[PDB]
Amino acid sequence: EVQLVESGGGLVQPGGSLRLSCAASGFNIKDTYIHWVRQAPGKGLEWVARIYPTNGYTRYADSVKGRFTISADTSKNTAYLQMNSLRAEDTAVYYCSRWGGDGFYAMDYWGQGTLVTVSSASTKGPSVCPLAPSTSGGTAELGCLVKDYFPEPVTVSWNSGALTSGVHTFPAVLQSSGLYSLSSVVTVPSSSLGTQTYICNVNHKPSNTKVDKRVEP
């Protein structure tokens, strides 16, 4: 039936440029209006632009005028958003959608969305710090702090992936600085402290960073 597939999202820096595509199948974009709508992380929906591919006529929100161009190619049944002069505030999931057709000005079909992140932060590997802990004959918590990296993601393992029970790697905080930090914890036997070797292996591919820290009590 009707489908809208988008592509072209990415990480870009302020002032940069990106192009999104919205490929329609199961109907003809000539019959209707195509729209872009965005959703910032944790926020609501904001309309960006619209085009009637039959005649090329466009409308924009003021927040993007002179920056973004909406266009269509009917022979490819595809609409585009040329995003120039990108700002941090443009960071969002970008959806295309269509009007029903005729008077039907509700948006009855939406694509799956494509993430666009705009940030002036530059790649930085994390610094990794062991977190040291005690209930005798009970359990203790140890961990690693993975501080000040960019961009996502990092992977953490313990003992090169041998140690799995009791491991919990937490989702990162995005700091006001624009950098991420996260932590990984393991709950271990108190009786094992000072004797068992515990090593966290932190991997940040964008910085080509591979760090192993031994955690002592």
Binding site: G42, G44, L45, E46, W47, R50, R59, A61, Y95, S97, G100, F104, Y105, A106, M107, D108, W110, G111, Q112, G113, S127, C129, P130, L131, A132, E141, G143, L145, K147, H168, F170, P171, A172, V173, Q175, S176, S181, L182, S183, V185
Partner: protein, 210 residues
């Protein structure tokens, strides 16, 4: 622009409840109003268009109504797949504008209390003349928590960074809070505390320059 003011911003409901969600337009928009449903990681889906018409395939427990500038979505008997975020939109003019959303959430019949784990700074940071307390929070439902930091007994305003809760694979939540200190501050006090409030109940952990 036309403002769509949606309320409430969230509500927790039981299966079978009658739920009504309200949206006021800042001016007349006639009946040019649509309701959308959105779930995590998915696109919006149209439920209701022209204020009160049910889009094709949408279960008839959904209804929409209009009274002047007041628009309402009613779910007559809430079903499990109805737990989601709802948005109103005016499409009367350009730009079309959306409400700010209502999250309809599963009420935690047995609520699940968080585990809290608190760590003092690491030496490696202290030697670089830095300090971070790490407060790690897991296995809680519902997925809302507030974090307060204490130096001795004094509330700590500055240097706090806290994640929004994120859904674990078991459908409970995890979150972290980071307090940035100077070594000076860390050592100038007897204790720092991380206090987590979930569903009105507090779990506190303390650490000390020890």
């Amino acid at each position: 622009d036309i403002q769509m003011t949606q309320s409430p911003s969230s509500l927790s409901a039981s299966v079978g409840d009658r739920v009504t969600i309200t949206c006021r337009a800042s001016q007349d928009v006639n009946t040019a109003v649509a309701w959308y449903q959105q779930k995590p990681g998915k696109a919006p889906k149209l439920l209701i268009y022209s204020a009160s018409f049910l889009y094709s395939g949408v279960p008839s427990r959904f209804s929409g109504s209009r009274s002047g500038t007041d628009f309402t979505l009613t779910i007559s008997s809430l079903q499990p797949e109805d737990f989601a975020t709802y948005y109103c939109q005016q499409h009367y003019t350009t730009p079309p504008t959306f409400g700010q959303g209502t999250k309809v959430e599963i009420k935690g019949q047995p609520k699940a209390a968080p585990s809290v784990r608190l760590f003092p700074p690491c030496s490696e940071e202290l030697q670089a003349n830095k300090a971070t307390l790490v407060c790690l929070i897991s296995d809680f439902y519902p997925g809302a928590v507030t974090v307060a930091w204490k130096a001795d007994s004094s509330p700590v305003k500055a240097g706090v960074e806290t994640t929004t809760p994120s859904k674990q694979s078991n459908n409970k939540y995890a979150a972290s809070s980071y307090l940035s200190l100077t070594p000076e501050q860390w050592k100038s006090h007897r204790s720092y505390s991380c206090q987590v409030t979930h569903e009105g109940s507090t779990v506190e952990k303390t650490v000390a320059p020890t």
